[PDB]
Design a protein around this ligand. Structure first.
Ligand SMILES: NC(=O)c1ccc[n+]([C@@H]2O[C@H](COP(=O)([O-])OP(=O)(O)OC[C@H]3O[C@@H](n4cnc5c(N)ncnc54)[C@H](O)[C@@H]3O)[C@@H](O)[C@H]2O)c1
Ligand SMILES: Cc1cc2c(cc1C)N(C[C@H](O)[C@H](O)[C@H](O)COP(=O)(O)O)c1[nH]c(=O)[nH]c(=O)c1N2
Ligand code: SF4
Ligand code: FES
Ligand SMILES: [Cl-]
Ligand code: NA
Ligand code: NA
Ligand code: NA
Ligand code: NA
Ligand code: NA
Ligand code: NA
Lengths: 418, 156
């Protein structure tokens, strides 16, 4: 039996039986087991279709990006193909945001779903070279993908003239080495070109100018994973899954003070309360929910649990990452941990980001330890509001966001530190 | 001067020949070097620069940017402990205390026999199984001191 590094068995549960159909089980599903559930047949179907028709189905699916900005996938592919080739396809598997551990279970348990979607996607946009960029702290995933890619090649789904279609593809797997910024799509590309992970000024978008200056689609693991399903069922059936306006399965990583922490494949009409109480089994010790941290992006109070988990103007949004804190949990100490993350992850290109992420964390620690001066307090307020100016990526745009929200929604807890 | 052993230079070449361009293999090459020596030996950078057809400056800048790489301390086993939000809520401090009791060291430190180094890391992407730690490529939830002790005993 081919042995991989030890991986914790993250709990996974689905009501939709799609992205988690196999990945609900904590083991590697290899190609024979995947082929037996009709795997790779959406590929065979896609190869009998024009690249344009595939683009068109994916568009009419209303599929939107799962890396957290929600950009329409079909529209993204259209933009790339309107520019001359050669073109490149990149699967973004960096998943390094706190509270986020969903992309990894697809990689580790159902590699072939991902690979199948990479091939269809590559063919749709005319790319003959694709890449998975997987974070370095995911060693088992790396080795699982390398082996699954070889299985796929052996059975003839990769290489030259795949299934007699005249379409060539090699998938290369790159590893990271400790940087959340390399999940930002331009920083990822820089790292693939063998450089440091410094984000580029956008526009240009990668679909115009990306890897080696050429048109490049960067899609997230889960986005790609929906592609085999769209081709398999047709775009009409995919759009019947969940709300008309938020179509498709969504994976929700629920962590913190919950009885049943793990990954939940649910439709997007699900509420935040239903995720924690109906699906994740309630709280540890039945304590009151104080806050939910949407990864390192937002902070929801216990008065905002009856919102839907969609990109709605009044929805949770983000990536549906649910870290739960209960009534006895120090919100200021939690914010510090969020401050420490951005401090370690700024690339340093933009000055307000470089200094702001540093100083936010440095000053917030002074506050937490009760060694902050009056000016340290007022400076902390100022820098938290001034990390964003001149920033070229979304890190510097958000590095003060969650913390601001704690200040505003838990003012009485902060005053205890003053 | 510094030359890489034959069994290792082979693997670096495999990496270099794998991607369409040599320079794309820098991170895999550095993971390999660190896997072989226990750390990134400072004298390894120049020869690798030559194999990737890159300036030494370039390579050194890369080693500095990527946190997994260590140019300072050799260790047979790196114990990556998550110090981010979820593991903290669930008992990062209990794992560190248990590591202190068993191994006698704190984050940043190496055992005197050069066998274990404790490296504090950001979210390892296993937050549901917090508190999380890795021993080289192996990843685990921490439950107790006794449980920790048994796991570490497996690294000889
Ligand atoms: N991480 C998550 O990601 C978010 C930020 O991600 P981002 O910076 O990639 O978001 P973004 O809105 O800048 O872009 C999202 C995706 O859509 C693409 N895109 C957007 N506008 C485009 C256009 N006009 N033409 C072509 N492609 C276009 C981008 O290239 C990217 O692939 C964070 O806030 C967090 O939720
Ligand atoms: C700081 C930071 C960090 C990340 C990102 C952005 C930023 C600003 N993005 C999103 C990324 O830029 C881009 O939207 C996706 O790669 C394309 O995903 P879709 O497939 O369209 O969702 C991102 N996406 C992803 O797939 N995995 C990740 O780990 C991250 N991390
Ligand atoms: S905003 Fe921050 S992380 Fe993004 S490019 Fe600028 S310095 Fe780097
Ligand atoms: S916060 Fe520790 S693994 Fe995510
Ligand atoms: Cl999703
Ligand atoms: Na199997
Ligand atoms: Na990374
Ligand atoms: Na760091
Ligand atoms: Na501290
Ligand atoms: Na001070
Ligand atoms: Na990990």
């Amino acid at each position: 039996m081919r042995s991989y590094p030890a991986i914790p068995r993250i709990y996974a549960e689905t009501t939709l039986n799609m992205l988690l159909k196999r990945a609900k089980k904590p083991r590697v599903h290899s190609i024979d087991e995947y082929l037996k559930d009709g795997g790779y047949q959406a590929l065979e179907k896609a190869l009998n279709m024009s690249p344009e028709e595939i683009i068109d189905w994916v568009d009419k699916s209303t599929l939107r990006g799962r890396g957290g900005a929600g950009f329409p996938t079909g529209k993204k592919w259209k933009f790339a193909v309107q520019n001359p080739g050669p073109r490149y396809f990149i699967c973004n598997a960096d998943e390094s945001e706190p509270g986020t551990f969903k992309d990894r279970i697809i990689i580790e348990r159902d590699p072939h779903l991902l690979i199948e979607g990479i091939i269809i996607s590559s063919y749709a946009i005319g790319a003959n070279e694709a890449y998975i960029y997987i974070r370095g702290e995911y060693p088992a995933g790396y080795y699982i993908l390398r082996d699954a890619i070889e299985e796929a090649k052996k059975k003839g789904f990769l290489g030259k003239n795949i299934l007699g279609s005249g379409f060539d593809l090699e998938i290369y797997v790159a590893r990271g080495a400790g940087a959340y910024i390399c999940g930002e799509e331009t920083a990822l590309i820089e790292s693939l070109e063998g450089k440091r992970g410094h984000p580029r000024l956008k526009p240009p978008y990668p679909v115009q100018k990306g890897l080696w200056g050429k048109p490049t689609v960067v899609n997230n693991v889960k986005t790609i994973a929906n592609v085999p399903f769209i081709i398999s069922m047709g775009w009409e059936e995919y759009r019947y899954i969940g709300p008309s306006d938020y179509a498709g399965p969504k994976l929700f990583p629920v962590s913190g003070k919950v009885k049943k922490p793990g990954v939940y494949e649910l439709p997007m009409n699900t509420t935040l309360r239903e995720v924690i109480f109906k699906y994740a089994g309630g709280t540890l010790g039945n304590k009151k929910v104080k806050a939910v941290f949407s990864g390192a992006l937002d902070c929801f109070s216990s008065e905002e649990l009856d919102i839907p988990m969609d990109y709605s103007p009044l929805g949770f949004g983000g990536t549906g990452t649910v870290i739960v804190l209960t009534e006895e949990d120090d919100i200021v100490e939690a914010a510090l941990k969020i401050a420490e993350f951005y401090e370690h992850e700024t690339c340093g290109q933009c000055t307000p980001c470089r200094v702001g992420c540093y100083e936010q964390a440095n000053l917030l620690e002074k506050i937490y330890k009760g060694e902050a001066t009056e000016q340290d307090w007022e400076g902390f307020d100022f820098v938290n509001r001034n990390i964003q100016p001149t920033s070229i990526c979304g890190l510097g745009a958000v590095a003060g966001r969650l913390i601001r929200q704690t200040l505003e929604k838990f003012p009485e807890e902060w005053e205890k530190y003053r | 001067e510094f030359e890489f052993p034959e069994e290792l230079k082979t693997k670096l070449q495999e990496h270099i020949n794998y991607f369409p361009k040599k320079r794309q293999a820098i991170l895999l090459c550095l993971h390999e070097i660190q896997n072989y020596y226990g750390y990134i030996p400072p004298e390894s950078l120049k020869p690798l620069a030559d194999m990737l057809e890159l300036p030494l400056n370039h390579v050194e800048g890369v080693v500095a940017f990527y946190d997994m790489f260590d140019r300072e301390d050799k260790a047979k086993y790196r114990i990556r402990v998550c110090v981010s939000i979820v593991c903290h809520l669930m008992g990062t401090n209990k794992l560190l205390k248990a590591l202190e009791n068993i191994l006698g060291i704190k984050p940043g430190e190496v055992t005197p026999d050069g066998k274990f180094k404790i490296v504090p890391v950001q979210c390892l992407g296993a937050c549901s199984e917090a508190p999380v730690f890795m021993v080289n490529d192996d990843e685990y939830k921490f439950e107790s001191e006794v449980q920790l002790n048994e796991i570490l005993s497996r690294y000889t």
